[model samples]
Target: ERRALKIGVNGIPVTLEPINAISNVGPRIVNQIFDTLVVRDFFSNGAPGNGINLMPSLAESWERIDDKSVRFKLRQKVMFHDGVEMTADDVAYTFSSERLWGPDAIKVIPLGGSYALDFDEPVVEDKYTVVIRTKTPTPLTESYMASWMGRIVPKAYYKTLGTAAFGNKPVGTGPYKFVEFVANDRVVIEANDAYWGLKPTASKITYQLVAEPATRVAGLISGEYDIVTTLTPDDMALINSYPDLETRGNIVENFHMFTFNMNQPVFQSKPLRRALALAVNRPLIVQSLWMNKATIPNGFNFPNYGKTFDPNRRAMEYNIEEAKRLVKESGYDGTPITYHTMGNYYANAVPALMMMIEMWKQIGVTVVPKVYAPGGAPKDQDSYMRNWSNGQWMTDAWATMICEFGPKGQVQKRWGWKAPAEFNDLCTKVSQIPDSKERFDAFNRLRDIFEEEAPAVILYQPFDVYAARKDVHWRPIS
Candidate 1:
């Protein structure tokens, strides 16, 4: 039988352009059409084990050429959706300084420079080989190739069509090829008969946009959709009641947190940062808002980082008395701090913010909740909710911790917050140090400093749940 799968999603991807598409919904369609250089072992379902989880995809094999460079051997005859044989040139063009980081290059939009680390243009050695050169002695070159910006594109095709046309009908080499993408409506793809790797089980896959959770669940039960994503824990019982339907979920690699703009005079006080950090009760928030489906991760890192994860490390303490004391010491004179949020971007976002606001109120801090449209979060605001994750599924602190909150990471560039010189030095060590013990030690110190300094407050790790037909045979990943 010819198989066709229909999925119900809460939101449709805003754009099909891989470089510019950074939201959580984008991966639902983009991953189907794009291929990365090296990918984590999908068969393992992102399970953590003995550190190394990488496997080859577009690049058959790779090796470090030196401290600042790495060489990749491309797989010959890998064809793009348009039937163009992918080569080293396409790989270079995908990560070129001009196409990516250069001045005239297409703006990546949102958090562009944050995800795709800075690097020099790749050198095409031959039809099947390319050399990636970084600006520093970066040890995570191979891991970066698996990032969101790592999706290889057809060099000639993208250049000819340009950004606008390319976004409307982008092409890549993956199990499924893009057929159509309608904003706030739906996206469709068909199996690529010429795909080099695993053939798609379904001939056609359609993602139907269903904004409401009740609508999504109704569609899944009525056979209008085979699967539904962004499900809540409350829907689990109903989904399991149907003999042919069930629910599946995994704790996403990222966590939900509020980031402070240190530039704001109200937040510059370390005592105030500590008071806010200690004010919220993560466990109570998870139980109330998340229905106890989420977990509180240890600092910014995860256990998937293997040796780098510190078992001794602790999350921010929850003590109302201590928080109140810190608030008084902060000398905050009843200034109403604006707390920015995006409507329902993260599951239970608005409700969770309300809970945090009430918690701070108990500690004599006044917080005014304000909903901001996408890209409208002012850098001048006291604080805002951040939808952050460890996109690199590798077992290292460099990608997860250092890349997001380190000295040169998004915390400084995007949040306008800077760590002291001591923390900055540790960030450098965590990225460049080769020794396993020393590197792990540095990573632990990095988290300790972050906690003591209270740059951001991590509430809890969220679970991405979905209701689907049992026969769909799919698993969710972070």
Candidate 2:
């Protein structure tokens, strides 16, 4: 099929720059126009599985060359969508950024996960081969490389265009090339008919920012778009009722959680943390906001993950009166509690935050909600609403450990004020455990500390929702 595909997104990303990419709408669009060295080895059904048996992608083969370095052999003859040949320099250049040289060099970015947190440099050994040097011998670096942790960019193209110029017109050795990107409006890309790999059948792909959920649904019903992601339950029903449309959904590993700046002296108290978690009613939030499409998480475990969720396990209570009692006795006076939230980051995020604020008011803690998206926000004493991804745990439970609560808390840059020494020591040894059962058990023991010493509280895991035209002849990626 040479037909074009148009997708409706709730909002766009702040920047499409690989280094600045976050796991949001804009970054999702960016992945189509870019290529990571390695990619997730999806299940036979093409569901995004754990990052265990990751397959080769841009880098056809990779090996641990030494104790501290891994070598990647580029897939030859693969040219950028513009028909320009790609090489090792491009891969090396993408990893060369201020991020690698910063003091907190080992940190997690949206696409990359925590894989880069162990590496210090990306050195090009040859035009066809690149060597990634790490702080230590990272035997499993390939998994991280294949993940969103490390994606390749056209070094030469980016140089000529600069960050601003290149974002709208990115050049990649992927199946598509950027044709247009209008701020707050739409992004259009055409397939690379000359791509060396299996070229996309769709001649054109357009991502129109439909911001409102209802409008996105309308776009699909009216045939303005062939596909639309991030749908609500009502939208799914409406699409199913249509003769020309179909809807599909899966359990995405994305979960909603809060991470606060532990550096804040006000948050140093334990009662406040416990009290804050109890104020908001999550089951009710799911009913109202998600229209019962979502489920409340127990601890960090979602029901979809087999044997991980214990229904009998206790969760933070959602009693307003109990939270008020703790707040009154905690001796904390009114302080400016500002919550930085992105309205469109998740469906009804701000509205949900507003609901939380009103609940906290009952506990006598005045909370101030502000619009803020990640990109060099203040590092000290603030709060953030984020959709954290932990779907990769089945293959590597350690991945969840390092990214979420590893010593530095790489994902959120958290340095817990009340971290236990026992917890820190296990984090190091657990990642080294060779036995799967033993390691999983060790990981569970540490999760027990989350409620008492965690930097923030988890809300719930969000559902992966989508709607599409019946005749689009397209396959959604896992």
Q: Go through the candidates in order and give each one's C-alpha lDDT.
A: 0.76, 0.67
- Estimate the TM-score of every prediction: 0.87, 0.80
Cα deviation in Å at residue 28, candidate 1?
A: 2.4
Q: Write the per-residue lDDT of candidate 2 for residues 204-323, one digit (tens) a residue.
A: 888877766778888888888888877756567778989988987655666677655555666666677668877878887788777777766667554433433445666755777768
Instruction: Report the CA-based lDDT of candidate 2 relative to the real structure.
Output: 0.67
**For residues 227-262, what per-residue lDDT tens digits would candidate 1 score against the true structure?**
888876777888899999998777776677776777
Best by lDDT: 1
User: Cα RMSD (Å) between model 1 and the true structure?
Assistant: 3.4
Best by TM-score: 1
